Structure 1
Amino acid sequence: GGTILVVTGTGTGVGKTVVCAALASAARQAGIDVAVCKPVQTGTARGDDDLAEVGRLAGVTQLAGLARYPQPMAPAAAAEHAGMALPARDQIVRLIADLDRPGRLTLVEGAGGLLVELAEPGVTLRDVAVDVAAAALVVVTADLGTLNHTKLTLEALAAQQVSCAGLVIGSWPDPPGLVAASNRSALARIAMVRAALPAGAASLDAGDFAAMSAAAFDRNWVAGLVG
């Protein structure tokens, strides 16, 4: 098959959706075919739709969803509130496998955190990554407390032998404060920092976003993602 990458965050609201789009844009521009998969989407009643956002910002059209829940809560609670159930583990793995093919980069966007329950019982994005032999791209902040959260996530990945594809600082302030710069240097000693996306990237139009995305990642790294 191709290259499957799960995109997860140290926490909720760290810019993970925008990272998926930036990476998708950079990969499309290197001539890589990109599919983006969101197995579990919550907060639809509030208008949350990360697949749609990825399409808006990066012009990706191969966008695969599965479970959508109205309330902006953790999937287990959002499902319970709507009188629905969570998807089965193999339903998630099947959705990803249908997209996977040679020369394609498939991004699997988690639902707010590596150990959030996506399927019963206690099945997480980490178990999914094991099933489909995916590495994990970890989206992080530059603020106080990021080093603990990142190290917590990276330890959890290694515990099931899920390779870490690297870190992305989801939102990098201009200008960088004293705390941010120090945290960035510390983040780079823990794992590779593939990119630090400028804040407000979600406001750029299709041209500026594509340009932002192209400059943000190392070309050699993106091209090296799929044969």
Structure 2
Amino acid sequence: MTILVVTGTGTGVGKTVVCAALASAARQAGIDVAVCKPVQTGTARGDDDLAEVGRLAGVTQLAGLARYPQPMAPAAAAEHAGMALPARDQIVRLIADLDRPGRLTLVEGAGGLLVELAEPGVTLRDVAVDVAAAALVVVTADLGTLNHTKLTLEALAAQQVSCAGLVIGSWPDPPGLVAASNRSALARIAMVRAALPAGAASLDAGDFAAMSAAAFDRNWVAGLV
């Protein structure tokens, strides 16, 4: 089994693009890639993180269980619809079924690590434990990332989930004073696996793929499977 949960320090942090960028680099090295997003909120607004990964990295095994119209935490969205979340069992078997020899499976949750994905109080962290996934955590390069990062790293270490490293979801065009010290700081805390250019999400499939193959150590990511 070769599963990696892609969590992050919160929502709107670059987890989806990182999913796409890793997917579209694992491919370039001839790795088969599936992406799972069990619970997707904000559909009335057009949120579809699976589609975005399909467009950007071309992945095709794109799996999901539940979608809620309202753009809030899954449990909030669920209850503003009057309809439960999936069960831990649905989410765990779904992911585990996705796994193939030679295949990288990426799981994006919703928001940060301890967001409730299933009933009762089940998180991406419980999922990772049950599928023996390592975790890749996506972080901003902005004010607050160090605290949010350390706080996520500890919460992972507390259930003995491996961090496979960090990825800056957006790295500034003019690279900034805060951002630069933040990167030096993060780098001393953990292995920073990639830093994605700031506009990577709005590139075209060829752009993105040259971007992605440049973003990651071909050696670390081939060694994932």
State the secondary structure of the residue aligned to 2:126.
helix
Q: CA deviation at 1:84?
A: 1.0
Deviation string 1:125-178 (CA, Å, 9 cap, x unpaired) is: 000000000000000000111000000000000000000010000000012101
Distance in structure 2 (CA, Å) of the matches to 1:102 and 1:157: 26
CA shift digits 1:82-103 (9 cap, x unpaired): 1110100010001101101111
Aligned to 2:194: 195
Partner Cα distance (1:115, 1:46) in 2: 24
1:26 CA drift (Å)? 0.4
- Matched residue, 2:18: 19
Deviation at 1:216, TM superposition (A): 0.2
Deviation at 1:202, TM superposition (A): 1.0
1:1-227 correspondence to structure 2 within 5 Å: 3-226=2-225
> In structure 2, how many angstroms separate the alpha carbons of the residues matched to 1:14 and 1:138?
10
Task: Give secondary structure in 2 for the equivalent of 1:29.
Answer: coil
User: 1:130, 1:203 → 2: CA distance?
Assistant: 33
Structure 1: tracts of 5 or more residues without a match: none
SS of 2:96's partner is helix
Q: Deviations over 1:183-204 (max 9, x none)?
A: 0000011110000000111111
TM-fit CA distance, 1:121: 1.1
Whole-angstrom CA distance in 1 between matches of 2:174 and 2:209: 22
**Inter-partner Cα distance in structure 1 for 2:209 and 2:61:** 17
Shift of 1:60: 0.6
Q: Secondary structure at the match of 2:33?
A: strand
- Distance between the aligned counterparts of 2:112 and 2:212, measured in 1? 23
- How far does the alpha carbon of each residue in 1:103-139 deviate from its partner, in whole angstroms, 9 at most, with x for none? 1000000111100000111110000000000000000
Gaps in structure 2 of 5+ consecutive residues: none
**Could you tell me the percent identity over the aligned residues?**
100
Secondary structure at 1:209's aligned position in 2? helix
Q: CA deviation at 1:21?
A: 0.1
Equivalences, count? 224
Separation of aligned partners in 1, 2:202 and 2:67: 25
> What SS is found at the alignment partner of 1:119?
coil
Q: Provide the rounded CA distance (Å) in 1 between the counterparts of 2:41 and 2:88.
A: 17
Deviations 1:40-81 (A, max 9, x none): 100011110000000011111110011111111000000000
Q: What CA distance in whole angstroms lies between the structure 2 residues aligned with 1:203 and 1:147?
A: 27
Classify the secondary structure of the residue corresponding to 1:111: coil
Task: Please state how far the C-alpha of 1:15 moved relative to its aligned partner.
Answer: 1.0
Between the aligned partners of 1:84 and 1:69, the Cα distance in structure 2 is: 9
Distance 1:178 1:117 in 2: 35
Q: State the distance in 1 between where 2:141 and 2:19 align.
A: 18
TM superposition shift of 1:4: 0.3
